[PDB]
Structure formats: structure tokens, C-alpha cells
Design a protein around this ligand. Structure first.
Ligand SMILES: Nc1nc2cc3[nH]c(NCCN4CCOCC4)nc3cc2c(=O)[nH]1
Ligand SMILES: Nc1nc2cc3[nH]c(NCCN4CCOCC4)nc3cc2c(=O)[nH]1
Ligand SMILES: [Cl-]
Ligand SMILES: [Cl-]
Ligand SMILES: [Zn+2]
Ligand SMILES: [Zn+2]
Lengths: 367, 367
């Protein structure tokens, strides 16, 4: 029987690592990409299809699920896993990014938003328990970008107080503490000293894993990478590092080069439904007239079921026609592509050729 | 190797028949229900899923496909089967029902509609060839309901002239004549004498199968059944009888009792996406608040993959949220339900207990 939580690093190359997280509901291969299932569904895919693409874990959201269908309701129905039919690990965000994204009244106690609903470290942790989340995220505040050093510091300090409250709420619930894991979230905007203070605070509290929060909020890749350069080494080496909300394939590769182990983003799903398909030669927009009679699959090397069977021409027709099958096929391919990217990353680190892979990947993707 | 077309009747009970149509691309068990795939997709389902529900054949549409993505385009891409990934038989309607349903200029030559597109017996048959249809429908005119006897007669007479033109166009195309089948369509509105004249004309021309056209156009079940009572026996007994656009489960049962072998309708797909699920105890609307915490499957006996795995409560959430997976699950279940209905019909006729099945079905469905 697998443990509640165990992270093991099998191979390294520079700051990059590959390994596994073992949890009760399954093993997660790292670096990992988590498809997003915000509304208790990875949009347009059955869970069996999500798994077939190679996903080990999916992401859910405290904020969205507390609104619809409700956290207490999901608990009454047996929990999120049973509800949606995904029996493997689920990581849930805490609501902290909705603390600035989707009327709000903020205080030291938490955030109320408008019917009116409240979130606090205690309520967020409770909701994640009711959902039966395997990886629970601390309740934080994603500092807006740009932020002044003073505002970034005040925000980060509140988040660290909330991180301690999250830890205590989680630990006070025996079933949760014994069966789930808790990750802390580093804040501090783009400021090295604040990132260090945040890392120190989180490590003092102690978590099963550490997220880099407050990025992928409009800063751009150069700045994100600059912040990762100094921020990731501040986190405990022996625990997973999770970069929230990232990202494009090149963002993922560069983040892995900087020590990140876990990723999530809506890009493959959302942009798939909008007609964007990922390929090793860069993204294409399948709606473009140039694809109307193209018999080739979305990508020439992709091993997914979509690329085995259907042409660009057919998918072009479906997306132009607003057909549901178009969304289904685009999404399955994009998620499969993302998982294949993660597999190539894992294999190349394992073989000590990740730097070469990154270079080759970029040369072709951006040709 | 299967023949171009062979219909064999294995068992009878009153006017009801069960048997098989053998065609080059596969066997069709009758009575048969054909899922509708108007836009080169059965909405929200992969072809493999359509097949898994038990479908032997699907329906496409000359009118819709000639507009998008285009008949010549589909031919250039290898035909409709290859295009959409369904390798079994496809029946295509001729456009004759759009001749009154979806600006139009009608003449003895055909129908022009507005870009401008033309349909005639010759062009309809040609389009169906370009698509690579297995069962080609004659180009007709679905007489509006209600119709005066004079107007119904004039319309029917034109349709019979068009049926002869359809026959000749089909026969003049060697590859089509050798590999596909051609069905004629009976018209005559609700008038017995006109239905007889139409049947006589079609039988004189000679077809592989015979559709009852001009019904399911607002007349209601009592009147439809009254017309079927005298119309079906006018058609050749040794060929399939196809009731176009029907229908609700009770309509199908009653039509089989009256000698119909083939059916199509958008009800399971369209109403599925709208939240209506078919059950042996009658349809339910899954959006209803009463289902919000109902852990039972859509139907208590249904053997489909949806009912094996997901609850009413989950599907209720998905449909209320406008989630694509909701459409996918509802549609798969409804099409599976329809196929299970057809299987029960076939088995009960084979066993000489169809009358009892019809009675039992109705008692429970309408309880
Ligand atoms: N709790 C918590 N969650 C986070 C989630 C984040 N997501 C992102 N970036 C991506 C934002 N997406 C872009 C696509 O539309 C939806 C929002 N950046 C994120 C940062 C955080 C964070 O600091 N805290
Ligand atoms: N060529 C041809 N096709 C037919 C198709 C028919 N469909 C129906 N009834 C169902 C109509 N649906 C109802 C759901 O919305 C779409 C149209 N009735 C139909 C009658 C005909 C017909 O006489 N000729
Ligand atoms: Cl999405
Ligand atoms: Cl439909
Ligand atoms: Zn693919
Ligand atoms: Zn079912």
C-alpha cells in the first residue's frame, strides 16, 4: 500500500529533476502536467480519455466547486473522485487566485465575495476536505502584477499568516491529515528579498510541497524566468516545486530547467476548443483555410488516438461548424501533446540529455 | 464477400418483421434505428461510441453536406466514410425535406435556394455519389401538412417523375449502381388513393427499398398511424420499409407493428443535449432540481457505459453548467437506449412475443 505522501528524485540534470510522488490514490510522475478540471470535468473529455493521454493527476478548484455544485453537496454524494469518475489523485487550488480574478471584501480573516460566499484559510481547507482533495493548497493571496515593494510585502506577509492558519486547519482534521498532502504557496511578487522571506516562512511551518505563486499574471516569460532563477532554489530541495498556472510548452521547458516539478494550465483545453492545436513545429490554428483539404493529422509524430484516425481537414470542418466533436478531438490531442512533452522531459532528464532536448525542442518549435 | 444489397426476413409477427440487410460495408439488423449525423458527425460522439451503442448504420444529409463542407470537397478527401471515420453503411437523405424546411424557387427541373445552390434529381444523386453513400434516397418533395387533395396529388405526381429521374441518374453511374442501393419515397399526404398511386409508380420503377415520406410533419401519432395502416401494405413486402423522421419510442413501436423496418430521428441526440434522458419509465429532464442529489444512473436497467459509471446528480450538474461532457454522456445514453429498444423489438418479433412486448413497454413507459 502506497504512503500518504512520498516524493523521490530518480535523476537530476542541473536544476532539473525527475522522479515520482507516491500517494494513496496513485503515483505521479514528475515533472508532471495536470489537466484542469475546474467544473468537476476536464472539458470535453471522459476521465478515461484524460488517463489514456497519460495524465496522473488533475486539478480542481475550491472557488468554482463551492459555487457549483457546492462542496457540501459533493461530500454528500461521496466526494469529487466518485462524483466525476476520476479515481486518481486530484490537486485543488485554494481559491487564492480568485481572490483577485473572478465584488470582493478582503480582510485579515479572509475574503467575502458576492449571493455571498466566504473564503478563509479555515473554510478553504474545509472545502478541500469535503471535496476529498489529495493535494490541498494553502489559502493565499496572489499578489497583483505589477506591485510596489511595500504592497508586495504586505500581501506576502498576510499570505504567510494564512499559510500557518491553513497548516493548522489541515492538521486539526485527522482524516485529512492522514490521507491528503498540503502544499504551501510562495509569494513576494518579483522581489528577491520578499521571495526569500516567504520561502523561509513556509519552510518554518513545513509543507509536503511548495508552489511558486504570484507568477503567470502578465509579467512575461523573461521576467518569470528571472524570478524563478532565484526563487526555486529557496524552496526545500527534497519536496516538489509547483509553478501555478504555467503554461505554454516553452514556459514549461524553461521552468523545468529552473527546478519546477509540477504544472497546470487551461491552454491545451481552452485553446483547443478555440481551434489551436499544438505540434512539434509550433501551434497551428485549425480554422485557417489552409487546412480545409489537408489530409495530414494534427501533428506528424503524435501518437494520440486523434492523430491516428482523423485529418486536419475533418477537424477544420468540425471546429468551423461549431461541432462538439471538434472540441473533443482538439482537446484530446492537445492534452496528449502536453503529456508527450512531459514524457520527453522526464526521459531526457533520466538520460542526462535534457539540455540537448530543450535546445532541439526550441529550434524546431520556433523554426 | 457481402452483396451490394440483400434484404432477408427471418421472422414475422402480424405486420412486423425482423431480419437483415446485407451491404458491402456491413450488415444492418432490422428493425433498425439510424443515428443522425447531419454535419458529418453524430453530435457529441466519436464513431466508435456510436458503434458501441449498437448502431449498424447512420444517416447523413445531401442538403447540409453540399453546403458545408461541400460534396466535391468530401469526394476529394476520399468520401464521407473516410472523412468522418465511420466505415459502416451510411444512408443519405436526398434534400427533399429541405425542399420545404430550411429562399426557394421550385420548378419541374428541381429546387434552387439561396449564395445560391441547386438541387435536382440528377444533382442530388450526384452529390450522394460524391459522398459515397451506401443507401441513396430518391430526390422528392415532402408535401407540407396539411395539404388539400389537389395539392397533395400534384406534389406526389412531381415526386414520382423525380423518382424516375433519380432511378435513371443512379443507374447511369456504373460505380454507384454496382456498390450502393437506391430507395424510393412514397408521397400522397394522408390520402389513401394518392398513397396507392405513389406506391404503384415506385414499384413500377423498382427500388431496393421504399420509404414512407410525407409523415412526421405535424399530423400527430393517431393520424400517422392511420396513414401507415393502409400505406405500408401498398409497398413491396420483400423490400425494406423506411419511415422517415420517426421518432419517439412509442412511435417506433407502433410503426413496427405496422410493418416499418427502418427509422431515424434527432430526438435522442438533440433532446439529449437539451437535458432529456430516455428511460423505460418514460423520459426525464435531468435539469430538474429533483435530480441534484440522485445517485442512481439515468436508467435503472440500461447497460450503457454512462449508466455503468455516472449518477443523475453528476449529469444534472454538467447539463446545468453547460459542460460539453454533459452533452456527450446524455447523447451516448439516449442513443444506447434507442438501440436497446430496437434490440428488444427484434428479439421479441423473433420469439413471437412482440405484441406482448409492445403492451408491456407502453404500460411501463406511460405509467
Ligand atoms: N492559489 C493560487 N493560485 C494561483 C493560480 C495561478 N494561475 C496563474 N496563472 C494563470 C491564470 N489563468 C490564465 C487563463 O485563464 C484563467 C486564469 N497564476 C497563478 C497564481 C496563483 C497563486 O499565486 N495562488
Ligand atoms: N426526402 C425526404 N425526407 C424526409 C424527412 C423527414 N423528416 C420528417 N420528420 C422529422 C423532421 N425533423 C424534426 C426535427 O427537426 C428536424 C426535422 N419527415 C420527413 C419526411 C421526408 C420526406 O418526405 N422526404
Ligand atoms: Cl479549460
Ligand atoms: Cl442532433
Ligand atoms: Zn495527436
Ligand atoms: Zn444508459
Amino acid at each position: 500500500d502506497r504512503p500518504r505522501f512520498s516524493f523521490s528524485i530518480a535523476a537530476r540534470e542541473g536544476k532539473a529533476r525527475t522522479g515520482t510522488i507516491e500517494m494513496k490514490r496513485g503515483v505521479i510522475r514528475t515533472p508532471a502536467f495536470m489537466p484542469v478540471g475546474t467544473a468537476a470535468t476536464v472539458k470535453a473529455l471522459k476521465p478515461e480519455t484524460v488517463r489514456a493521454t497519460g495524465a496522473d493527476i488533475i486539478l480542481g478548484n475550491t472557488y468554482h466547486l463551492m459555487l457549483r455544485p457546492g462542496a457540501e453537496r459533493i461530500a454528500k454524494l461521496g466526494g469529487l473522485h466518485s462524483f466525476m469518475g476520476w479515481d486518481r489523485p486530484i490537486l485543488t487550488d485554494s481559491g487564492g487566485y480568485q481572490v483577485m480574478s473572478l465584488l470582493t471584501k478582503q480582510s485579515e480573516e479572509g475574503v467575502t465575495f458576492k449571493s455571498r460566499h466566504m473564503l478563509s484559510p479555515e473554510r478553504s481547507i474545509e472545502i478541500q476536505h469535503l471535496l476529498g482533495s489529495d493535494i490541498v493548497m494553502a489559502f493565499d493571496e496572489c499578489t497583483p502584477y505589477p506591485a510596489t515593494p511595500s504592497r508586495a510585502a504586505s500581501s506576502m506577509e498576510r499570505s504567510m499568516r494564512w499559510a500557518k492558519r491553513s497548516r493548522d486547519a489541515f492538521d486539526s482534521r485527522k482524516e485529512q491529515a492522514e490521507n491528503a498532502a498540503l502544499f504551501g504557496i510562495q509569494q513576494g511578487s518579483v522581489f528577491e528579498n520578499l521571495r526569500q522571506q516567504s520561502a523561509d516562512a513556509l519552510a518554518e511551518i513545513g509543507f509536503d510541497g511548495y508552489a511558486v505563486g504570484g507568477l503567470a499574471v502578465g509579467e512575461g516569460q523573461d521576467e518569470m524566468f528571472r524570478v524563478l532563477d532565484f526563487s526555486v532554489p529557496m524552496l526545500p530541495d527534497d519536496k516538489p516545486h509547483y509553478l501555478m498556472g504555467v503554461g505554454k510548452p516553452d514556459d514549461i521547458v524553461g521552468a523545468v530547467e529552473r527546478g519546477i516539478d509540477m504544472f497546470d494550465c487551461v491552454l491545451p483545453t481552452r485553446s483547443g476548443r478555440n481551434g489551436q492545436a499544438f505540434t512539434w513545429d509550433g501551434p497551428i490554428n485549425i480554422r485557417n483555410a489552409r487546412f480545409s483539404e489537408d489530409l495530414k493529422p494534427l501533428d506528424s509524430e503524435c501518437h494520440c488516438a486523434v492523430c491516428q484516425k482523423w485529418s486536419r481537414a475533418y477537424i477544420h470542418h468540425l471546429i468551423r461548424a461549431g461541432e462538439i466533436l471538434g472540441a473533443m478531438l482538439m482537446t484530446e490531442h492537445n492534452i496528449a501533446f502536453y503529456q508527450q512533452l512531459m514524457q520527453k522531459i522526464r526521459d531526457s532528464i533520466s538520460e542526462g540529455r535534457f539540455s540537448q532536448f530543450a535546445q532541439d525542442f526550441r529550434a524546431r518549435y520556433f523554426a
